[PDB]
């Protein structure tokens, strides 16, 4: 067989009566989840995977763009000098798992090597009819509600020697982040367990040291649109933007409580789908609360550190294909002959 590009279909456990928008979308875009999921191990088979060049990622991006365009309608769209107005009702918006499945004539191969970094040969391969269920969570900096690594933190990068390449981190132990807009209406905050977060950075440093045996520094974002300089996400149908300086401000040499992140709810946002701004209605009243798992990170490594005893990493993101890649890295589509 051979790698191929096709249109995968999607499956989900959506319900007809839910007005939550992922359910509504999946009701017409997907089939019910597979009643009979089977993995078939391929004996003695080796296969090349590349999470960074994977058309599954490209289709998922297209699909979640259509989900958002149908679901979260802004009052006004500012694409170019133009202005496009429409009805702007508040909605229930909470991701559900979506599976991607092979059409007839095709197969999805799955890397079963738990230590696979995302690019290169995999010695332990199976065939599947569908991926696992993936929540299409849109966020920057912190990856939420995703899959976890089994034994140790994973550092995934097309080539980490190249400072222009995005770094996707996968955690082993999830870290709860709890965000609240209490009953100024735009003001909110996120809480993170300090001990857990510090243990998380320790584990991440341990793996990064395998690539750079140096002092490892975490520093905050140093530029870009608000969406990428903050941890942005949505909750309760509202868009949150959280300062992550208190998460990314530490130095870890070879040796010798609660973190509070302030947040703001924005009405003016930069679309991730395409270039342009969108305006949404002022915030709903009442209490808004989201409790999520941090399961990964998107990082950038400072370049040009010509002769330093340290490497510096900062939170990054913005290309949501990196979010889809963090889940789809172990899959590829092939045409069976």
């Amino acid at each position, epitope marked *: 067989w051979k790698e191929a590009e096709t249109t995968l279909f999607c499956a989900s456990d959506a319900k007809a009566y839910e007005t939550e928008k992922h359910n509504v979308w999946a009701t017409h875009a997907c089939v019910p989840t597979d009643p009979n999921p089977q993995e078939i191990h391929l004996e003695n088979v080796t296969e090349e995977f590349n999470m960074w060049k994977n058309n599954m990622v*490209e289709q998922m991006h297209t699909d979640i763009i259509s989900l958002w365009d149908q679901s979260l309608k802004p009052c006004v769209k500012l694409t170019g000098g133009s202005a496009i107005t429409q009805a702007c009702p508040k909605v229930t918006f909470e991701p559900i798992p979506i599976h991607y499945c092979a059409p007839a004539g095709f197969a999805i191969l799955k890397c079963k090597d738990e230590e696979f970094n995302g690019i290169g040969p995999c010695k332990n391969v199976s065939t599947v009819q569908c991926t696992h269920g993936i929540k299409p969570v849109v966020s920057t900096q912190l990856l939420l509600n995703g899959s976890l690594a089994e034994k140790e933190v994973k550092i995934r990068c097309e080539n980490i020697t190249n400072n222009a390449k995005t770094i996707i981190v996968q955690l082993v132990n999830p870290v709860k982040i709890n965000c609240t807009r209490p009953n100024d209406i735009r003001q909110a905050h996120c809480n993170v367990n300090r001990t857990e977060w510090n243990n998380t950075l320790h584990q991440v440093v341990e793996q990064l040291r395998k690539h750079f045996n140096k002092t490892i520094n975490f520093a905050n974002s*140093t530029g870009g649109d608000l969406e990428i300089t903050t941890h942005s996400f949505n909750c309760g149908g509202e868009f949150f933007y959280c300062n992550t300086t208190n998460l990314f401000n530490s130095t870890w040499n070879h040796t010798a409580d609660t973190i509070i992140l302030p947040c703001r709810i924005k009405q003016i946002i930069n679309m991730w789908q395409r270039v342009g701004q969108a305006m949404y209605a002022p915030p709903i009243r009442g209490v808004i609360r989201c409790e999520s798992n941090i399961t990964g990170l998107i990082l950038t490594r400072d*370049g040009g550190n*010509t002769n330093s005893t340290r490497e510096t990493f900062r939170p990054g993101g913005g290309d949501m294909r990196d979010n889809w890649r963090s889940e789809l890295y172990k899959y590829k589509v092939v045409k069976i002959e």
Partner: antibody
Framework: QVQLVQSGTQMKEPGASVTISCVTSGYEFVEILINWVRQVPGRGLEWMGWMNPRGGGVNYARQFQGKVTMTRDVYRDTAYLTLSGLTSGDTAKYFC?????????????????????????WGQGTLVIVSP | YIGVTQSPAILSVSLGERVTLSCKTSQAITPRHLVWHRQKGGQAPSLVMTGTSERASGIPDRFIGSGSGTDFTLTITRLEAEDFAVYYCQCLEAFGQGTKLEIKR
């Protein structure tokens, strides 16, 4: 044809700020990382940083952190370099520059997908002279 | 950070001569990552080689790129007047300090 065209020579007093523009044409601006390179007269090439025009994310060389700001206006196909707290050490020629494209007409294109460092298309350079 | 060293910094050469420019990386690299540029009179540099050995647009076949590991070379088989310039190797964000071709007398 791809073209990067920069603003003209500037003279600035010490302590002042300066902004250099880099207006691009002949390709999809938002799809390719912009880099800036400094060259003090008579000296070698020094990479300063890159900026992703999609979202405006940046990466600055340590030597220039606190000195440089790299921004863009996507609607105007223009990248900017701003230098703050000017000193005599900042007198130099500044180039905007981009490497080869990689998207190959695929549906979704981001500059971070490319190699970046096969620098191919340069602006003509902008001289900044720091003097009171 | 992988450093780049170019030495000699000045080569004194003559028309018609075979000239060898050297570039050394501080650790081993893939040849995919080594680039050569030339610059005349402080104007915008222009591309000579990418991926160690593939000639850029407009570059004639008297320019030959080779090397692997940490040691890379740009060879000009027969020097012409238009070839006199400063040549820079680039590896990722790092530049060498340049080699200037000068007229021997």
């Amino acid at each position: 044809q791809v073209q990067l065209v920069q603003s003209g020579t500037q003279m600035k007093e010490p302590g002042a700020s300066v902004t250099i523009s880099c207006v691009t044409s002949g390709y999809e601006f938002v799809e390719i990382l912009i880099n800036w390179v400094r060259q003090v007269p008579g000296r070698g090439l020094e990479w300063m940083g890159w900026m992703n025009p999609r979202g405006g994310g940046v990466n600055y060389a340590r030597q220039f952190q606190g000195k440089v700001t790299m921004t863009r206006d996507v609607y105007r196909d223009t990248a900017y370099l701003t230098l703050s707290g000017l000193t005599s050490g900042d007198t130099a020629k500044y180039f905007c520059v981009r490497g080869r494209s990689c998207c190959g007409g695929r549906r979704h294109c981001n500059g971070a997908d490319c190699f970046n460092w096969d620098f191919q298309h340069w602006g003509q350079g902008t001289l900044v002279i720091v003097s009171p | 950070y992988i450093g780049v060293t170019q030495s000699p910094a000045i080569l004194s050469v003559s028309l018609g001569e075979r000239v060898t420019l050297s570039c050394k990386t501080s650790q081993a690299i893939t040849p995919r990552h080594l680039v050569w540029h030339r610059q005349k009179g402080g104007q915008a540099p222009s591309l000579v080689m990418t991926g160690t050995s593939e000639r850029a647009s407009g570059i004639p076949d008297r320019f030959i790129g080779s090397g692997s590991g940490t040691d890379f070379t740009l060879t000009i088989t027969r020097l012409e007047a238009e070839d006199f310039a400063v040549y820079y190797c680039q590896c990722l964000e790092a530049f060498g300090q340049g080699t200037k071709l000068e007229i021997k007398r």
